[PDB]
Amino acid sequence: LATTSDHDFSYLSFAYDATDLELEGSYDYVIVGGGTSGCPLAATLSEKYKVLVLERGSLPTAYPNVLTADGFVYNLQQEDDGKTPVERFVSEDGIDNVRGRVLGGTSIINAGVYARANTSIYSASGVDWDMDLVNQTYEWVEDTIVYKPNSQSWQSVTKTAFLEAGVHPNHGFSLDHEEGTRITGSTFDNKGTRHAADELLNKGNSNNLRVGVHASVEKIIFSNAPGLTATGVIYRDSNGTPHQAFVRSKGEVIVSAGTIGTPQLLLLSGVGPESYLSSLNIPVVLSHPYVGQFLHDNPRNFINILPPNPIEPTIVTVLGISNDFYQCSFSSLPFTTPPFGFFPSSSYPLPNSTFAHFASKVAGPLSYGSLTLKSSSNVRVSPNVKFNYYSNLTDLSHCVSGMKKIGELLSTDALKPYKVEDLPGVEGFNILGIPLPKDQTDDAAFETFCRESVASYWHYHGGCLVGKVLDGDFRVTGINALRVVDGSTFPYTPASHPQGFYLMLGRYVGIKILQERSASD
Ligand SMILES: *[C@@H]1O[C@H](CO)[C@@H](O[C@@H]2O[C@H](CO)[C@@H](O[C@H]3O[C@H](CO[C@H]4O[C@H](CO)[C@@H](O)[C@H](O)[C@@H]4O)[C@@H](O)[C@H](O)[C@@H]3O)[C@H](O)[C@H]2NC(C)=O)[C@H](O[C@H]2O[C@@H](C)[C@@H](O)[C@@H](O)[C@@H]2O)[C@H]1NC(C)=O
Ligand SMILES: Cc1cc2nc3c(=O)[nH]c(=O)nc-3n(C[C@H](O)[C@H](O)[C@H](O)COP(=O)(O)OP(=O)(O)OC[C@H]3O[C@@H](n4cnc5c(N)ncnc54)[C@H](O)[C@@H]3O)c2cc1C
Ligand SMILES: *[C@@H]1O[C@H](CO)[C@@H](O[C@@H]2O[C@H](CO)[C@@H](O)[C@H](O)[C@H]2NC(C)=O)[C@H](O[C@@H]2O[C@@H](C)[C@@H](O)[C@@H](O)[C@@H]2O)[C@H]1NC(C)=O
Ligand SMILES: *[C@@H]1O[C@H](CO)[C@@H](O)[C@H](O)[C@H]1NC(C)=O
Ligand SMILES: *[C@@H]1O[C@H](CO)[C@@H](O)[C@H](O)[C@H]1NC(C)=O
C-alpha cells in the first residue's frame, strides 16, 4: 500500500502534445490508449525498450476536478464537448453510460474502489497465469496508488447494515474479493487526492518512455514481413495533421483502447467479421468473426434514500459481497445538474438534500451484446453498443436476490434512524426514484423492479475475448506483432470492482513480453 501524497506528475517531463511529436517515429513498442491497463504496460516495457503511448484525451492537469474525491460527481455532470474527460454514450438498450477520455483512462474518473480479483477465476480464464507474478504485480501497483481508507461515518453505518443483514463473514480491512463484508482499498488517499493509472508511468524509464496526448489513433498499419504483421499506427493531432509511429524488429503494437475503443480500432483497421467489413467497404486485413462480439455490462440496480437528518458525503470503501451480486453504498450532496450515467436516463428526479445510494451489481454478467461502428471512417464517432440486460434469466434471478438483500439492509436496526416514518419492513423511507416492492416475497414484482429500474455499473468489458480473438498470450490470432491488453479480453468481471485487475494486467503482460524478449536475445 502507498502513503498519502500529492498526485505524482513527474512523468510530465516526457509527455507531449501530438502536435509536437515527430511526423514519423520509430519505437520498439507503440501502445494505443494511455488508460488503466495501457499506462502500467507502457511503463513496464520502457524499463528496457523504447515505448510510445498515444492517448486521445488530455493530461489530467487540464481538468483539475479529476484529481479529488469531491470532484467525482462533477466530472459526470460536465457537458460533453468532445474533449472533456468523461465521454457520454447511450447503449442501444437505452441506458446512459460513460467512458474515460484522458491520460490515465477511466481510472481517472472512477469511484476509486480497489480490489484484487477473485483468486478462483484465474484457472478457467484461458490464460496460464504465473500467480507469483500476479501478486508481485498487485503489490507494485498497490505500493504506488492504493490506500487504506479513513474511517467514514456513513460507510460505517453501511458496514453495520451489511453485518446485520447476514453478509458474512467480516473480513476487516482486506483487498481481496471474498464473500462477506469488508473495508477495501481505494485509489483516493486519506486527503481525498485521486491517484490513478497515469502515475504508474512514473515507474517507467524517463529516457525510454514517451507519451503523446491529444493523439487520436485512427488505424493500425500492416504488412507481410513475410507473414501478416502490424507495423505501426496512424494518429491525428489537434491540427488535423496525421502522424505515423512504427515499431522495429521484434517490437509490437499493443491496443489498450478499452472495451469500447479496442474493438472499434480493430474494425476500422480491417480486422473483424468479413461480411460486416465488406458491407461498409472497409478492406479486410484478416477475417476475425469475434471482434466486437461478447460485450458484457453488469447491471446496477439500486435504492436512493433521503434521510430526514443530513448525512455526510463519503467515498465507497465498504463492500457487501455475495456470490451472485456485489453491494455498497455511496452518500452524496444534493444537485440540480444530473451526473450523466448515474441514473439510467435524463428524466429522473433530482435530490434537493443529501442522499444515500445503495447499489447492487449482478455477477458476470451472463447476458451479452455486441459493438458495431456508427461511422465507417471516423474513430472520434462513438461506436454503437448493446448489452442486452437480463436477456439471460439467471442474471435476473441474481438481481432479484440482490435487491431482496438491499431490502434486508433497509429493514435493519442500523438503517432505522434514516427513515422519515417508523413503518414496518422496508417502508418509511423518503425514496428518490423507483421504490422496492413492499412485499419482500413477491418475486414477480422484484423482476419488474429489476427490469424497469436497471442502470449500468460502468464495469462493462469484453469485445475482444481471449479464446475468440486473442490467444493465451493476448496476441491477436493470425497477426504478428499485435496484442490487446485492457478490459476487452474477458467475458466476466474479475471482482466487484475491476480496476485492480486491469491495472495488474497491464504490467503483467508487460513482464511476459520482457521475459519473452530475454529468451530470444
Ligand atoms: C496471492 O495473493 C493472495 C491474496 O490476494 C493469497 O491468498 C491469501 O493467502 C493467505 C496466506 O498468505 C491466506 O491466509 C490468510 O487468511 C487465512 C484465512 O482467511 C480467511 O478467513 C479468516 C478467518 O477465518 C478471515 O479473517 C479472512 O478475512 C479470510 O476470509 C488465515 O487463517 C491466515 O492466517 C492468513 O491471514 C488467505 O486466505 C488468502 N486469501 C485469498 C484471497 O485466497 C495467495 O496465497 C494463497 O494461494 C492459495 C492458492 C494457497 O496456496 C494459499 O495457501 C495461499 O495462502 C497468493 N498466491 C501466491 C502464489 O503467492
Ligand atoms: C463512472 C465510472 C465509475 C467506476 N468506478 C470504479 C471503481 O470505483 N473501482 C473499479 O475498480 N472500477 C471502476 N470503474 C471501472 C474501471 O474504471 C474500468 O473498468 C477500467 O478503468 C477500464 O480500463 P481499461 O484500460 O480497459 O480502459 P480505459 O482506462 O478506459 O482506457 C482506454 C484508454 O484508451 C483511450 N482511447 C480510446 N480509443 C482511443 C483511440 N482511438 N486513440 C487513442 N486513445 C484512445 C481512452 O481515452 C482511454 O484513456 C468505473 C468506471 C466508470 C466509467
Ligand atoms: C444463460 O447462461 C447460462 C450459463 O452460461 C447458459 O447455460 C449454459 O450454456 C452452455 C452452452 O450454451 C452450457 O455448456 C452450460 O452447461 C450451460 N450452463 C447451465 C447452468 O445450464 C444459458 O444457455 C441456455 O441454457 C442452457 C441450459 C442451454 O439450454 C443453452 O442452449 C441455452 O442457450 C444462458 N441462457 C441464455 C438465454 O442464453
Ligand atoms: C469466485 O470465483 C469462483 C469461480 O468463478 C466462484 O465460484 C465464486 O462464487 C466467486 N466468489 C465470489 C465471492 O464472487
Ligand atoms: C425536494 O425533495 C422532496 C423529498 O424530500 C420532494 O418531495 C420535493 O418535491 C423536492 N422539491 C422539488 C421542487 O423537487
Same domain membership, residue 212 and residue 257: yes
- Assess whether the C-beta atom of 352 lies below 6 angstroms from ligand 5: yes
Q: Are residues 197 and 177 in the same domain?
A: no
Co-location of 95 and 69 in the same domain: yes
Q: How many CB atoms lie within 10 A of CB 58?
A: 18
Residue 357: active-site member: no
Same domain, yes or no: 333 and 375: no
Which residue, of 456, 471, 500, is where some domain finishes? 456
What's the CA gap between 291 and 276, in Å, rounded? Answer: 11
Is residue 365 within 8 A of residue 326, CB to CB? The reply is: no
d(CA 196, CA 109): 9
Is residue 4, in this structure, part of any structural domain at all? no
**302 within 8 A of 327, measured Cβ to Cβ:** no
Q: From 161, 193, 147, 515, select the one nearest 320 (Cα to Cα).
A: 161
Query: Rounded to whole angstroms, how far apart are CA atoms 511 and 515?
Result: 6
Residue ranges making up the domain that contains 316: 147-191+298-366+390-456
The enclosing H or E element of 410 equals helix 393-410
- Please say whether the beta carbons of 134 and 501 come within 8 A: no
Tell me which of 1, 168, 176, 508 to substitute to probe ligand 1's pocket, judged by most ligand atoms within 8 Å of the beta carbon: 176
What is the spatial distance between Cα 43 and Cα 204, in angstroms, rounded to a whole number? 4
Identify whether residues 58 and 110 lie together within a single domain. Answer: yes
In angstroms, the CA 206 to CA 25 distance is: 18
CB 29 within 8 A of CB 51: yes
Q: Are residues 152 and 139 in the same domain?
A: no
Distance 165 CA to ligand 1 centre (A): 25
Count of domains for the chain? 2
Q: From the CA atom positions of the chain, what is the Rg in Å?
A: 22
Residues 264 and 248 in one domain: yes
Query: To what resolution in angstroms was this structure determined?
Result: 1.6
Q: Confirm whether 1 is domain-assigned.
A: no
Tell me whether residue 459 is one of the annotated catalytic residues. yes
Q: What does the alpha-carbon distance between residue 335 and residue 357 come to, in Å, rounded to a whole number? A: 14
Measured between alpha carbons, how far is 232 from 25 in angstroms, rounded to an integer? 9
Residues 400, 339 share a domain: yes
- Of 305, 302, 344, the closest CA to residue 325 belongs to 302
Question: How much distance in Å is there from the Cα of 399 to the middle of ligand 5?
Answer: 29
User: Cα separation of 141 and 199, whole Å?
Assistant: 10
Residue 462 lies in a domain: yes
Looking at the structure, tell me whether residues 123 and 266 fall in a common domain: yes
* Residue 2 falls inside a structural domain: no
Picking from 456, 479, 513, the residue at the C-terminal end of a domain is: 456
Greatest CA separation for the chain: 76
Cell matching residue 325: 451480486
**CA 145 to ligand 2 centroid distance, Å:** 16
Query: At residue 59, what is the residue type?
Result: L
Where among 456, 471, 495 does a domain terminate? Answer: 456
Nearest Cα to Cα of residue 503 among 47, 156, 185: 185
Q: Mark whether 394 and 418 lie in a shared domain.
A: yes
DSSP string, 435-473: PPPS-TT-HHHHHHHHHHH-EE-S--EESS-BTTTB-TT
Rounded Cα gap, residues 223 and 26, in angstroms: 16
Binding residues: 36-37, 55-56, 102, 106, 110-113, 217, 328, 457-459, 487, 498-499
DSSP annotation of 20 reads G
Q: Write out the DSSP string of 184-246.
A: -EESB-TTSBB--GGGGGGGS-TTTEEEEES-EEEEEEEEESSSEEEEEEEEE-TTS-EEEEE
CA dist 396 to 142, 365, 373, 446, Å? 35, 10, 29, 9
Distance, CA of 255 to CA of 37 (rounded, Å): 10
